[PDB]
Amino acid sequence: YERFIRPMGLRYKKANVTHPTLNVTVQLPILSVKKNPSNPLYTQLGVLTKGTIIEVNVSDLGIVTASGKIAWGRYAQITNNPENDGCVNAVLLV
């Protein structure tokens, strides 16, 4: 997580993480991001593509909606939907 990686001037190290388990979307800070192995970007140089792997801690939400039993560092996939949410979105796989 000590390696610094980003696309080009992203808003900040935060993404709207949708948790299917809780059925809630909460913006969490991104602890670390992992590049796409082949980088499907067609010289776009804007934002990363869907399926980008990030590492986030599902505990710092502070909402406490699942008794804290869900507390664990998990990997989520970035999926930017600026036309719908207007923000960088992330989805948690279960």
Side-chain angles (χ1 to χ4, degrees):
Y1 68 94
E2 299 177 71
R3 300 183 68 180
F4 293 100
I5 169 176
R6 68 282 179 165
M8 184 180 291
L10 73 171
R11 50 180 290 166
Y12 204 79
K13 293 180 180 180
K14 288 184 175 64
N16 291 336
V17 182
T18 301
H19 303 81
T21 303
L22 311 178
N23 190 29
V24 75
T25 192
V26 180
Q27 186 177 210
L28 288 64
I30 309 302
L31 282 301
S32 183
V33 301
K34 296 179 179 62
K35 64 172 67 178
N36 296 276
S38 186
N39 193 332
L41 288 168
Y42 297 93
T43 322
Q44 292 300 91
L45 302 177
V47 298
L48 290 170
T49 57
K50 55 174 63 177
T52 302
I53 303 300
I54 60 171
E55 190 176 320
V56 297
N57 179 267
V58 59
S59 305
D60 199 29
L61 290 71
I63 61 174
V64 189
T65 190
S67 306
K69 66 185 180 182
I70 56 168
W72 181 245
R74 302 181 189 274
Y75 296 93
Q77 293 173 330
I78 301 298
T79 175
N80 297 278
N81 297 90
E83 301 180 301
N84 187 31
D85 296 278
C87 302
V88 178
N89 317 94
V91 60
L92 180 62
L93 46 88
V94 294

